[PDB]
Amino acid sequence: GSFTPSGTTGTTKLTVTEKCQVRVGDLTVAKTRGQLTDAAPIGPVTVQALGCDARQVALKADTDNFEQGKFFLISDNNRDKLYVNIRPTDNSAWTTDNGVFYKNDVGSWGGIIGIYVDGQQTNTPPGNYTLTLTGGYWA
Amino acid sequence: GSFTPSGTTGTTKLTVTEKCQVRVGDLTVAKTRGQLTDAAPIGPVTVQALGCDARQVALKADTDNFEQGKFFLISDNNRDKLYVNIRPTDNSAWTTDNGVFYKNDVGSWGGIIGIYVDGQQTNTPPGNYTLTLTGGYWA
Amino acid sequence: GSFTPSGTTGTTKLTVTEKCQVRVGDLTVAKTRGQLTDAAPIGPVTVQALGCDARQVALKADTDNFEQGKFFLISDNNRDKLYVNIRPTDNSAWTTDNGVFYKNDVGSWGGIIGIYVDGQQTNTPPGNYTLTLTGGYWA
Numbered sequence A, B, C: 001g002s003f004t005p006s007g008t009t010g011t012t013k014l015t016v017t018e019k020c021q022v023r024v025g026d027l028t029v030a031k032t033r034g035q036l037t038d039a040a041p042i043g044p045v046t047v048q049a050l051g052c053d054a055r056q057v058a059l060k061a062d063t064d065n066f067e068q069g070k071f072f073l074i075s076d077n078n079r080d081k082l083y084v085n086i087r088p089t090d091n092s093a094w095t096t097d098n099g100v101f102y103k104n105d106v107g108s109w110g111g112i113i114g115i116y117v118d119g120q121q122t123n124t125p126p127g128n129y130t131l132t133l134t135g136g137y138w139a
């Protein structure tokens, strides 16, 4: 049960707004709180492993993004949570262990990890939410 | 007189330099202090509102970017100001209220907000200057 | 012996990993620690000077990136160093002076500055390393 950081970082960002939504500057991922329905896709996270034929690929969430076996995006001020489910788009088997989401089998896996809203959270306060995931391997 | 944050953030950045100017890395917006003449354009800010047929679109500047009914870009160290005027490129009417720049009429407005140097400031200390504007609505 | 900041900033980033390397999200510069051999290229830094016909172009490294006439990328936590050599790809002559790398002759130089691993450092701890260089002129 140990994660070894070894890889790069993917940052999933979402700006939550009200129905009257004012987009300023370049396009970013934004949704009204009413769109935060159960299983709503937030976005994909690409994963490409190399040199892991004998290790279990893994992603570790920043400390501020997990608690009690649950993952969540966190607001800029660290106060507000948006609970999510993390799931590879393929049929591969993974396990969650204290902020770590690791593959059950060894191998240099490449694939897409989807981030989805876990439970309708249409009362989420408007703000900027982030989930940070770092590549590495588990054992 | 209340701003409700609801939208994304646009960041206007400018690096001020001397006449001998050394650009390192990728292109960014940079000017010599001698170019900071009155009404000099710093750059455009896009605004695209959705679902605001019954609200007044608004942009709020970060606390560090306004004081006394005046807006300004602020240096990285929070010390130096570059006073600017904020004005939509179209003929629409807006109002300034304590760091908030709001549209006089309701509607899902889309347009360009220009950022211009307010008063010649050719003695501005070289540094990195930023103005941050967040989308939302006023009332 | 004085650097005057006047120009923009170039940030050289490198993520060091183990042999089992898990890339998450968009492509960034990453190497296994085994690739950190002597003279290994980390990446180029573009420099384009304007209005410097009578000044010596210069780049100053952030305080956290130099000590004792040596430059280094520094880990996110400020603890770990990756010593590098900084060298223009052309035949021009430069001098190092306390975190400052300046050109020996005046002129509005444009060119590429290469960043190379200085001494094999294959035991470098996995992490994110950065070197920040700001444009200006020396005298």
Ligand SMILES: O=C(N[C@H](CO)[C@H](O)c1ccc([N+](=O)[O-])cc1)C(Cl)Cl
Pocket: A041, A042, A043, A044, A045, A089, A112, A113, A114, A115, A116
């Ligand atoms: O954002 C996602 N999906 C969309 C549907 O809204 C779509 O299925 C999709 C799948 C893959 C993809 N990719 O691989 O880049 C992008 C979008 C899920 Cl992976 Cl969270």
Ligand SMILES: O=C(N[C@H](CO)[C@H](O)c1ccc([N+](=O)[O-])cc1)C(Cl)Cl
Pocket: B041, B042, B043, B044, B045, B089, B112, B113, B114, B115, B116
């Ligand atoms: O940067 C601006 N303007 C330039 C002139 O220097 C030009 O008028 C312009 C107008 C619109 C624009 N846009 O819509 O992206 C970009 C440049 C002003 Cl909007 Cl501040």
Ligand SMILES: O=C(N[C@H](CO)[C@H](O)c1ccc([N+](=O)[O-])cc1)C(Cl)Cl
Pocket: C041, C042, C043, C044, C045, C089, C112, C113, C114, C115, C116
């Ligand atoms: O990254 C570098 N070099 C590569 C070799 O790995 C190559 O020589 C190169 C040279 C110039 C260049 N550029 O000008 O953008 C990019 C790569 C050195 Cl400049 Cl550090």
